[PDB]
């Protein structure tokens, strides 16, 4: 069940970095947030989609450096 903690942490990491992509719109941040999201377990299949969808949206807005 350290494996519950891992999965829980991947989720926070992804939440945190996606929130931060939304803040800077950089290629650097995009890369962090996209990997983080792809790392989240199908266990959270739902919040994974919402974060991915959130990423795609920052991409629609456009990147800046």
């Amino acid at each position: 069940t350290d494996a519950t903690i891992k999965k829980e942490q991947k989720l926070i990491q992804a939440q945190n970095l996606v929130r931060e992509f939304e803040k800077t719109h950089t290629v650097s941040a995009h890369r962090k947030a996209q990997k983080a999201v792809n790392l989240v377990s199908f266990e959270y299949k739902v919040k994974k989609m919402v974060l991915q969808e959130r990423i795609d949206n920052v991409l629609k807005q456009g990147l800046v450096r």
Partner: protein, 297 residues
């Protein structure tokens, strides 16, 4: 550091993927790696930040089209009823692993392929076997050679497994032991190697697991010609590919004393990828140089 390879030399790498199971990956390779390389060396402002989104769409498009070739087993082949290729399934693993930074990539797709290779295609001694060679033999680079095939292929598949490890750790239980059994086979046979290409590729595989040392490291390093390249009589392209694997191994070793003549030889090849038969050289040279630009003091 050395100067980054100029973005302008890379424009032609932004390519539509088309064709079937294999050729869709031939199309996906250059754009995947060109975005990887440009992102790392930060050339997007001075080249076209907005062309990046266009490349991202093309990559998304290759990924998507590639899923139309995913078999029930999680393996890949040119066509859904073709017997699945060990090399191709491992190569899709390699490319998608690098694309996790770029687009939505489904773990179950990627780890599913990983799991299938381990479960279906690994021998008890740790060798990986190809039971259904790809149609596009020009796309497998220096593996097309017939000698030292179990070592070249095993190192190739092992490299994919090592690049999928972070992504697949929690869902593929078999992965760490599969990595070790493959390492074991490579280590036991490394000293008998004759081909520079196999030495470079198995050397990168071994180094990633800290197994390239002692007499094996000495073998690796002294196979270089003039301390700057790994080459065999054959096509130049296999040598740019082998030298790029060897540079990744050096980087893994943090042997930054050996690195700069190897980077200078590659840069002086003016090899900008793309074209018939270029898949492995294109992916590997830009993976290697991006790693170099990321790592080297």
């Amino acid at each position: 550091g050395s100067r980054s390879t100029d973005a302008e030399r890379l424009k032609h790498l932004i390519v539509t993927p088309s064709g079937a199971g294999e050729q869709n990956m031939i199309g996906m390779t250059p754009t995947v790696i060109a975005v990887h390389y440009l992102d790392e060396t930060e050339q997007w402002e001075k080249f076209g930040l907005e062309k990046r989104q266009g490349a991202l769409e093309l990559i998304k498009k290759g990924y998507t089209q590639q899923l139309a070739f995913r078999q029930p087993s999680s393996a890949f082949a040119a066509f859904v009823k073709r017997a699945p290729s060990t090399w191709l399934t491992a190569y899709v693993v390699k490319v998608f692993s690098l694309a996790v930074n770029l687009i939505a990539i489904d773990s179950q797709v990627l780890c599913g392929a990983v799991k299938w290779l381990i479960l279906e295609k690994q021998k008890p001694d740790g060798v990986f076997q190809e039971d259904a060679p790809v149609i596009h033999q020009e796309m497998i680079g220096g593996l097309r050679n017939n000698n030292e095939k179990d070592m070249a292929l095993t190192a190739f598949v092992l490299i994919s497994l090592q690049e999928a490890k972070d992504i697949c750790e929690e869902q593929v239980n078999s992965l760490p032991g599969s990595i070790t059994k493959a390492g074991d086979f490579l280590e036991a046979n490394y000293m008998n190697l004759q081909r520079s290409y196999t030495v470079a590729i198995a050397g990168y595989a071994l180094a990633q697991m800290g197994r390239l040392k002692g007499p094996l490291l000495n073998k690796f390093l002294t196979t270089a010609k003039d301390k700057n390249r790994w080459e065999d009589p054959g096509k130049q392209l296999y040598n740019v590919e082998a030298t790029s694997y060897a540079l990744l191994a050096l980087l893994q070793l943090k042997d930054f004393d050996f690195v700069p003549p190897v980077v200078r030889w590659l840069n002086e090849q003016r090899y900008y990828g793309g074209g018939y038969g270029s898949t492995q050289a294109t992916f590997m040279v830009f993976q290697a140089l991006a790693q170099y630009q990321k790592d080297a003091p």
